[PDB]
Design a binder for this molecule. Structure first.
Ligand code: MG
Ligand code: ZN
Ligand code: ZN
Ligand code: ZN
Lengths: 559, 141, 158, 196, 160, 133, 49, 264, 65, 86, 43, 114
RNA sequence: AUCGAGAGGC
């Protein structure tokens, strides 16, 4: 398991990672020193010899360079310590261990290797600083983050090996995931929020901004688009300049909520021939979602156009965001005083419900539903009441939150944020749960020594009325800490359990491949399935299709 | 003098505690909405009152600013980070010869400190700098 | 109505409308015979297996059945002439594009489907984290280890 | 890292002219994304920004102690007394252009920590290198200038791509390829070979 | 349970229906009981469905539970992968565990077998049983350090 | 090369749809009861107050890279105070013998319904819109 | 500022870590598993002082 | 006076000058600010060699501190970049050589202020290399503290430089930039809880510009030609010379571009 | 360890201020903010450098060698 | 054993080149080009062996046969010219 | 330094979870994420 | 360890011209100039002054990477009007404005008395 | 070389 299935390998590297908006998606920011260490064997040919000579002339310590040279006899020549680094004459058929150079095939990997996507071919981009550098859109397949995550790079050593990396393992090829029949990678974080803000109808961009934005697109035609508004002042919608990034011949239709063709909300998306007609770009439009723009461009235009599309969208949207700006503060978490008073009276009404149900239980008047303990029924009622109170207060806060509030804007774009975050940050974090129920009495008939015995009130049982802004009370803090401790324990255990599950799954199905007869088989030859997937189709090619015949009235079907 | 006692976990089961001294006060409306909602204790016959609730936290947690306003896992993470944080570990470092030692050029006392920090000596021997920080989208890096 | 199958008819239809610049007011150039017989011939043209023997031919027909239902639904003579006006050229182009895309969509021999399947189940499981039913990772462990005794056996009665 | 669980690394270093600036000319020492904030609910980080600003202008300390009845509204009242917006938002101008930033930016002093993790120690690269004797495989660790492990899980990942030649070169020529002599009748490497 | 059923006009319409859920499973007895539809009855336990309704029903139930596990988180996996795992368990007569006992026990190559678990016991029994490894399996070639019959290695290449 | 359509409308209502700079406008053609117009308009460039009556025109021209119009030496084709460029997304029949045309001026959305414009306002990439107070 | 609490062995400052353990001479009743011959068990951990 | 950019200096001092940069385009204001921050040359220590160090602080700490110390650079244009002169390592027209020596004779702690630094190099009659002293006491920046029995001796070679190579060579501390105080251009969208006006404090510069009138519409054509600035100097170069030398450095860059075209 | 020469944010020299600031607090019992205002530091970025500083030089001096 | 070969007639394997097939053919051709082998396509500004192999694939000039293998052991041979690339 | 000098290790039916009896006798937050989370706690 | 020397930001390297002029492909009367060892300071001013000229149709500067001190200016002008001439006129206008600013500021400062 | 401990990521 440790020396044959896996082994330490030469020509490997590891480094902390950071992300470059200006780096291309397939490119990887290999640091210069790492390239100086890593060598690829290149046989001298009439086509390359000149460069090779200069490389050997340039030397191992400065890149582009070479560390060693191999003769036909095979005696290595170490350029670092040799009297002959200068006089070398390269006879044909000799080998040069050249440094790793720009636009070379490499492999980039993150150590939880749960995916074919987790190890992907990348193009070398030698860079000054010491960090490995990668595009934002490539984070999702690796699940990488820039908190300090380290990543590994492996250098192919033969032309066939390089060909396999480039022709099968390349980032563009894996853009559509065979799993989940949807793209792996999409627009994330600042690009997403900025794309929403730019696509808004109110967003307009002047000729200076438009001009520099147009230049920022690498494959720009050189034709300035006709302004959306021409008379009072020449003005361009953000949708127009964004369209400049969209390749021609791309059509997208999406209807959500009240998506009238008039679309007052600016909801839904309509794109014709690489131009956007109406809508606001968000995660569903521009993310890894099925039916996403990435899916369409990968399927019609090709993978390379889609990778360049990632790059161009990032460049334009990042420029506009950089000059528009974005921020998040406490005032985003703060909600209106009237809204706060309505939230607190909502919580109080839930408390009144709990007290009345408790008193009815004390009178034994309550009737247990079939199949549950009377105490079980009491717990279910109280838990549901408090959860509903928390959700209602959060929804009240969401209504109060303005369109200017930045947490709302992140939610609308979908980069980060959720309803629960606003609810806990502004209105009520809620009731914590340990092992399934409300907090138990570790002490005798009391959850904490400060509480009286035999108290099942929400305060005793771990419901935290206060919000994070409002400030947790001591008892609330302890109960919250208990819940968080359970969360961390579950995380630590779940990772190990899932690792075992994945290893057993892989070991069971490792032999399974589609043979030339299309029969799914193993080494013994036993046929697991005669046609792979029962249709013999690759799932990345597969997309959602609507079958109109199955649905509808017989009269409508006839008509 | 008997003004204070030492109570273990098993002896606690018999005792009833109040978080605030102000809890043991006569009870009689208009309150600041921003102040955290505190439940009326609805209890009497207190044996004891807690010295300070913040005493439940450890040394690393007492470094954390406003932990009552943050979710617990983040507080745990930071408590793990203070061990990683560089700073002036001791004054005799120049005299001492440790296998490895890291020390900030210009250590700075935090602008916002815990009361407990006084007994932690963190202000006397800090481990961070009060950097002027902007939360913004800029250049995408 | 919505299920995952190869080839997107909607995009092909819009691509035909844009590429050949169809105008709706002009009547079509397509005889009904052409539309119907071409749909049938295209059904004969989408191939997953090549064998001469009848069991392989039946396997091919069985494999392509649902896709052929989708084609017949979307390539309906009333729709092809009314819902989206289609000149003859556009309809032949649609047939050619559908066949080419379908041929591209077939799994390549030599793909390691088992390793990919194991990885494809494993990755979402790592994401799973959190009303009395065994669920999530414990349920998955029970399912994979063919657990004789289950924490939450249950019977739904219809 | 910040005091509220906000880990991070330097993506880039920017000179003062390139950095955004307030009307006072104050330039941020550090830039953090808003996006990291909503998911982790680290409100106290924001509160600390506000309170540290008020303390720096006041010349008095800031009480960040737990279970203290200090309200965001009151600290904001003090900040407004000092002539800044209550929530700490500050009008900022792009350094590259001088154009006003459309979004007012959360600006404030916040305590930050330099963690023990620095890149140049982490950086490692081997190419050809020393080999452990028993396995004939590469040695382990940066300190020994070792070779990174190609995990069996990573090998499965490679199998998913089908790059058999890359896997063989990684697992034979890169690590521990060796030539042995066998006899069919033995079936084992019992052969004694005098090569020269 | 709300259900979708064809209306006489043909459009699918809501069909609310009372449905029972039981703590235990004795399926062989339950289906014969009157007042129920024996066709639609479902047991969450695959083994009881397999013993009562044959192996094919067990395969369907195996898939159904795996799909429910994926769907609770909202995650989606294509039918082919989950199906493939279900087949790997179902094809060899009965449900075969993904454990040492079960899938690892097979006529599969001894080196591939030893790679998972119980390595030395498998190798010892192979020595005693005089098993001969075809070396068709991938793990055998990885141990052999030879290009696996995988992807690019599936087809031999020769001059024209 | 010539004007495709012209009319004079009176605004039924103006609605700021969660936008500070853009208001949706719904208007009825004066002198015609069969023609209605909805249109998203930047109010800051051109204030569009309710109960005002505005002249509206749609022309095919008056492509190559846009250029600033010298010092106005190139002849303005616009006495009107407000002008936009857009492409029509959909053409629909509200009822038989009654047409409706959907235009998009880079995101600001217009709908125009009547039966008169059978021979003009054909589906085209170019449709300049010109509004006079 | 140094507070001690550590030993110096071979010049290395080694600190003793506290170990948690269940108290002796405490009597506790523990329900046996449902599939077990015996229903309940009462356990005491007797150690001299 | 002359047509073009017009300035009106509201208040002035040797450290702070405050003016209104009327009738200029924004790009010029931004570029001038960047040049002032970075591009103006100044003299600062780029080499320290320590013969004796008994101080508790390490040598590199003190070298960084010495680099930060401000020194007079009025005649720095007469001084020549060490990378621009032919000196083997340094010479008198390129470098200014200083030495520092201090012993803790006093039982009390002896401080090392920047006034203790002295010049070994030959000045050749340029106002160069004198440490800036603004303290009322006349003592300089406190470089180090020395107990009795402790001494430090070193030599510092100060060189001409630009802030883009290191922040020490920067001549300006904090430049204040404001335009459109009433936000008539609407260049920023205010973030308001209830009302922007009460929440956002008034700028002082707001009084100079005429207040907005609610009735009038937004002027789309309007662009900002009036800018309000305040320039602060560390004292190595006076404020007036700081702004003028920034102007001249920017125009020199532009002229170099023109000359490069002519060569091409 | 010792008072920074200049604020990291502005670059304004702060090395002149420290001693005076201390004496200003002791001589006239000033409030720390008022002392900062008299010392010419009116921006919180430069103010933090004097408030947050803990002069660890003094302990280092006390060690005899 | 002996002559366990499918006739070229009645071959049922996919006429289209598999991704792995193209990749291995291109890699082998790139290797031989890199080791001083003759090139059967005119080159217009190409020095990379892989780019030469791709151009040759467009020409269909690469002489090689892909031997598709079947679980029964019977082998079907398709020349690069016969195979269809898309 | 201080946290190491005030640390407990429990060698090893729910030890990891924070217990109500752990109120004021150990820190709720301080614990190492990983295999030993909850097993090792600080006073 | 890997960091570039700071002098590269303002010192021209070996074999590097300050300006390199290349015609735009697929765009008429357009040129892309690579300003080496220069920053936003120069590019923004050049672009704005170019915009003030009526003949210039396109003027934009892009910083291909924040790491490297280079910026690209693309210029499109009317036919018969050389973009190089437009650049020269814009730069010279900038210089004249800077000189006028210097003189006016000198006057104002000499009036100032403190 | 073993053993042991501590930290980093998901
Ligand atoms: Mg991470
Ligand atoms: Zn033998
Ligand atoms: Zn010299
Ligand atoms: Zn400052």
């Amino acid at each position: 398991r440790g020396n044959l299935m896996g082994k330490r390998v030469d020509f490997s590297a590891r480094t902390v990672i950071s992300g470059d908006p200006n780096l291309e998606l397939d490119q990887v920011g290999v640091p210069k020193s790492i390239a100086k260490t890593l060598t690829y064997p290149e046989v001298v040919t009439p086509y390359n010899i000149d460069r090779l000579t200069q490389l050997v002339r340039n030397g191992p310590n400065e890149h582009p360079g070479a560390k060693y040279v191999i003769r036909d006899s095979g005696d290595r020549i170490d350029l670092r310590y040799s009297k002959r680094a200068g006089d070398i004459q390269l006879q044909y058929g000799w080998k040069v261990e050249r440094h790793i150079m720009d636009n070379d095939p490499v492999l980039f990997n993150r150590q939880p290797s749960l995916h074919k996507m987790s190890m992907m071919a990348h193009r070398v981009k030698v860079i000054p600083y010491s960090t490995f550098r990668l595009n934002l859109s490539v984070t999702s397949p690796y699940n990488a983050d820039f908190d300090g995550d380290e990543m590994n790079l492996h250098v192919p050593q033969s032309e066939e090996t390089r060909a396999e990396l480039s022709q099968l393992c390349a980032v563009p090829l894996q853009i559509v995931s065979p799993q989940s029949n949807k793209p792996c990678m999409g627009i994330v974080q600042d690009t997403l929020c900025g794309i929403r803000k730019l696509t808004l109808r109110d967003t307009f961009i002047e000729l200076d901004q438009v001009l520099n934005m147009l230049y920022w697109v690498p494959d720009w035609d050189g034709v300035i688009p006709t302004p959306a508004i021409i008379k009072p002042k020449p003005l361009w919608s953000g949708k127009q300049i964004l369209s400049v990034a969209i390749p021609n011949g791309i059509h997208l239709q999406r209807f959500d909520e009240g998506t009238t063709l008039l679309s007052p909300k600016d909801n839904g998306m309509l794109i014709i021939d690489g131009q956007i007609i109406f809508g606001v770009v968000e995660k569903k439009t521009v993310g890894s979602s099925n039916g996403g723009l990435i899916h369409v461009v990968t399927r019609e235009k090709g993978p390379q156009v889609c990778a360049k599309l990632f790059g161009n969208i990032q460049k334009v949207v990042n420029f506009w965001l950089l000059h528009n700006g974005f921020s998040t503060g406490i005032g985003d978490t703060i909600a209106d005083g009237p809204t706060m008073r309505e939230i607190t009276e909502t919580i109080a009404e839930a408390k009144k419900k709990v007290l009345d149900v408790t008193k009815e239980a004390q009178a034994n008047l309550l009737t247990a539903k079939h199949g549950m303990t009377l105490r079980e029924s009491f717990e279910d009622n109280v838990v549901r009441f408090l959860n509903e109170a928390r959700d209602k207060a959060g929804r009240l806060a969401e209504v109060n939150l303005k369109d200017l509030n930045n947490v709302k804007q992140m939610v609308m774009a979908g980069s980060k944020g959720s309803f629960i975050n606003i609810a806990q940050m502004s209105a009520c974090v809620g009731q914590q749960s340990v092992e399934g129920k409300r907090i138990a009495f570790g002490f005798v008939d009391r959850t904490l020594p400060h509480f009286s015995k035999d108290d099942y009130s929400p305060e005793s049982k771990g419901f935290v009325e206060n919000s994070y802004l409002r400030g947790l009370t001591p008892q609330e803090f302890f109960f919250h800490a208990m819940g968080g401790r359970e969360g961390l324990i579950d995380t630590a255990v779940k990772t190990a359990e899932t690792g075992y599950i994945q290893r057993r799954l892989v070991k069971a199905l490792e032999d399974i491949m589609v043979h030339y007869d299309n029969t799914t088989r193993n080494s013994l030859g036993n046929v697991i399935q005669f046609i792979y997937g029962e249709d013999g189709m690759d799932a990345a090619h597969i997309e959602k299709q609507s079958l109109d015949t199955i649905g509808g009235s017989d009269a409508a079907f006839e008509k | 003098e008997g003004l204070v006692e030492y109570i273990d976990a098993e002896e606690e089961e018999s005792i009833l505690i109040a978080m605030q001294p102000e809890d043991l006060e006569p009870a009689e409306l208009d309150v600041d909405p921003a102040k955290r909602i505190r439940v009326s204790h609805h209890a009497t016959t207190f044996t004891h009152c807690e010295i300070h609730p913040s005493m439940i936290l450890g040394v690393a947690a007492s470094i954390i600013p406003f932990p009552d306003h943050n979710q617990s896992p983040r507080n745990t993470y930071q408590s793990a980070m203070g061990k990683q944080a560089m700073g002036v570990f001791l004054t005799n470092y120049n005299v001492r010869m440790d296998t490895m030692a890291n020390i900030l050029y210009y250590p700075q006392k935090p602008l916002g400190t815990t009361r407990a920090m006084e007994y932690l000596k963190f202000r006397e021997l800090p481990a961070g700098q009060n950097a002027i920080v902007a939360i913004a989208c800029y250049s995408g890096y | 109505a919505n299920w995952p199958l190869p080839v997107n008819i909607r995009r092909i239809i819009q691509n035909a409308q844009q590429t050949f610049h169809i105008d709706h007011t002009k009547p079509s150039d397509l005889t009904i015979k052409d539309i119907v017989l071409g749909v049938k011939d295209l059904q004969e043209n989408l191939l997953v297996l090549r064998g001469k023997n009848e069991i392989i031919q039946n396997a091919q027909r069985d494999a392509v059945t649902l896709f052929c239902c989708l084609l017949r639904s979307r390539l309906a003579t009333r729709r092809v002439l009314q819902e989206y006006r289609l000149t003859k050229q556009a309809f032949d182009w649609v047939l050619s594009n559908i066949e080419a895309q379908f041929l591209r969509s077939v799994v390549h021999p030599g793909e390691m489907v088992g390793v990919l399947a194991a990885q494809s189940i494993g990755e979402p499981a790592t994401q799973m984290t959190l009303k009395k039913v065994t669920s999530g990772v414990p349920r998955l462990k029970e399912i994979l280890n063919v657990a004789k005794n289950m924490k939450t056996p249950s019977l739904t009665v219809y | 890292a910040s005091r509220h669980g906000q880990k991070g690394t330097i993506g880039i270093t920017y000179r003062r002219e390139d950095m955004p600036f307030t009307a006072e000319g104050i330039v941020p020492d550090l830039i953090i994304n808003p996006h990291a904030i909503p998911s982790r609910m680290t409100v106290a980080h924001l509160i600390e920004c506000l309170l540290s600003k008020v303390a720096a202008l006041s010349g008095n300390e800031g009480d960040a102690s737990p279970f203290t009845d200090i309200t965001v509204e009151g600290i904001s009242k003090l900040l407004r007394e000092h002539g800044y917006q209550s929530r700490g938002f500050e009008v900022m101008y792009n350094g590259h252009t001088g154009k006003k930033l459309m979004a007012q930016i959360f600006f404030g002093p916040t305590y930050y920590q330099r963690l023990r993790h620095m890149v140049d120690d982490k950086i490692h690269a081997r190419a050809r290198g020393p080999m452990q004797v028993l396995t004939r495989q590469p040695v382990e660790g940066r300190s020994r200038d070792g070779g990174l492990r190609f995990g069996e899980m990573e090998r499965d990942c490679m199998i998913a791509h089908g790059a058999a030649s890359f896997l063989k070169e990684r697992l034979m020529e890169a690590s521990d390829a060796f030539r042995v002599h066998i006899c069919g009748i033995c079936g084992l490497m019992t052969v004694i070979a005098k090569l020269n | 349970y709300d259900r979708k059923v064809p209306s006489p006009t043909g459009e699918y319409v809501k069909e609310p229906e009372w449905v029972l859920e039981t703590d235990g499973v004795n399926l062989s007895e339950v289906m014969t009981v009157p007042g129920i539809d024996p066709t639609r009855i479902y047991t969450n336990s695959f083994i009881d469905i397999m013993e009562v309704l044959g192996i094919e029903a067990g395969r369907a139930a195996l898939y159904k539970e795996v799909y429910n596990v994926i769907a609770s988180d909202g995650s989606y996996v294509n039918y082919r992968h989950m199906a493939l795992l279900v087949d790997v368990m179902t094809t060899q007569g009965g449900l075969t565990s993904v454990t040492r006992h079960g899938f690892n026990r097979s006529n599969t190559g001894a080196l591939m077998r030893c790679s998972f678990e119980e390595t030395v016991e498998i190798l010892f029994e192979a020595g005693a049983s005089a098993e001969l490894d075809d070396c068709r399996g991938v793990s055998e070639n990885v141990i052999l350090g030879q290009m696996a019959p995988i992807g690019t290695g599936a087809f031999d290449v020769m001059i024209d | 090369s010539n004007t495709l359509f012209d009319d004079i409308f009176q605004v039924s209502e103006v609605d700021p749809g969660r936008y500070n700079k853009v208001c949706r406008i719904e208007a009825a053609s004066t002198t015609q009861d069969q023609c209605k117009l909805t249109l998203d308009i930047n109010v800051e460039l051109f204030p569009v107050a309710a109960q005002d009556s505005l002249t509206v025109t749609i022309a095919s021209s008056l492509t190559r890279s846009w250029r600033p119009p010298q010092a106005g030496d190139r002849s303005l084709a616009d006495d009107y105070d407000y002008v936009m460029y857009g492409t029509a997304y959909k053409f629909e029949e509200v009822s038989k013998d009654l047409i409706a045309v959907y235009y998009s001026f880079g995101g600001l959305l217009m709908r125009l319904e009547g039966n008169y414009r059978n021979l003009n306002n054909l589906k085209q990439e170019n449709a300049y819109l010109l509004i006079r107070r | 500022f140094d507070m001690g609490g550590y030993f110096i062995i071979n010049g290395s400052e080694k600190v003793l870590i506290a170990q948690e353990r269940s108290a002796g001479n405490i009597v506790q009743v523990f329900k046996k598993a449902a599939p077990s011959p015996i229903s309940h068990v009462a356990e005491i951990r007797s150690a001299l002082e | 006076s002359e047509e073009g950019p017009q300035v009106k200096i509201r208040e002035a001092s040797k450290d702070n000058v405050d003016f209104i940069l009327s009738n200029v385009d924004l790009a010029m204001a931004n570029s001038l600010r960047r040049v002032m921050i970075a591009e103006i040359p100044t003299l600062a220590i780029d080499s320290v060699e320590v013969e004796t160090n008994t101080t508790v602080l390490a040598d590199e700490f003190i070298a960084h501190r010495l680099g930060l110390i401000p020194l007079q650079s009025m005649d720095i244009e007469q001084l020549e970049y060490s990378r621009d002169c032919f000196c083997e390592d340094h010479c008198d027209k390129c470098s200014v050589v200083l030495t520092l020596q201090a012993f803790g004779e006093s039982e009390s702690t002896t401080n090392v202020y920047s006034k203790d630094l002295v010049i070994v190099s030959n000045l050749m009659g340029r106002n160069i290399g004198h440490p800036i002293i603004q303290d009322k006491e006349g003592n300089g920046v406190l470089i180090c503290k020395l107990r009795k029995g402790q001494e430090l001796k070193l030599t510092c070679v100060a060189k001409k430089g630009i802030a883009k190579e290191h922040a020490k060579w920067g001549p300006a501390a904090a430049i204040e930039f404001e335009y459109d105080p009433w936000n008539k251009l609407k260049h920023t969208d205010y973030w308001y809880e209830q009302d922007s006006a009460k929440e956002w404090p008034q700028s002082k510069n707001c009084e100079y510009e005429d207040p907005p009138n609610e009735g009038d519409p937004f002027d789309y054509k309007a662009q900002a030609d009036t800018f309000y600035m305040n320039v602060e100097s560390v004292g190595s170069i006076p404020v007036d010379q700081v702004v003028v030398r920034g102007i001249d450095t920017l125009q020199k860059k532009v002229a170099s571009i023109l000359l490069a075209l002519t060569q091409m | 360890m010792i008072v920074p020469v200049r604020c990291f944010s502005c670059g304004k020299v702060v090395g002149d201020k420290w001693e005076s600031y201390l004496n200003l607090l002791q001589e006239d019992e000033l409030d720390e903010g008022t002392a900062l205002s008299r010392l010419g530091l009116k921006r919180y970025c430069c103010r933090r450098m004097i408030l947050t500083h803990v002069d660890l030089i003094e302990k280092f001096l006390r060690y005899n060698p | 054993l002996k002559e366990k070969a499918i006739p070229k007639d009645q071959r049922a394997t996919t006429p289209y080149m598999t991704k792995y097939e193209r990749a291995r053919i291109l890699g082998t051709r790139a290797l031989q080009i890199s080791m001083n082998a003759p090139v059967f396509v005119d080159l217009e500004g190409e020095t990379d062996p892989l780019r030469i192999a791709m151009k040759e694939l467009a020409e269909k000039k690469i002489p090689l046969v892909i031997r598709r293998y079947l679980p029964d052991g019977s082998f079907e041979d398709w020349s690069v010219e016969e195979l269809i690339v898309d | 330094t201080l946290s190491h000098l005030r640390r407990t290790n429990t060698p090893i039916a729910k030890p990891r979870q924070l217990h109500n009896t752990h109120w004021g006798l150990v820190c709720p937050a301080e614990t190492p994420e990983g295999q030993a989370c909850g097993l090792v706690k600080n006073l | 360890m890997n960091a570039p020397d700071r002098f590269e930001l303002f010192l021209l390297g070996e074999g590097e011209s300050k300006l390199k002029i290349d015609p735009d492909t697929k765009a008429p009367n357009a040129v892309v100039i690579t300003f080496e060892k220069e920053d936003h300071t120069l590019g923004n001013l050049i672009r704005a002054e170019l915009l003030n000229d009526r003949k210039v149709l396109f003027a934009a500067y892009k910083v291909e990477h924040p790491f490297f001190a280079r910026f690209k200016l693309r210029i499109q002008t009317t036919e018969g009007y050389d973009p190089k001439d437009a650049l020269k006129n814009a730069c010279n206008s900038i210089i004249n404005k800077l000189g006028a600013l210097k003189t006016n500021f000198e006057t104002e400062w000499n009036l100032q008395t403190l």
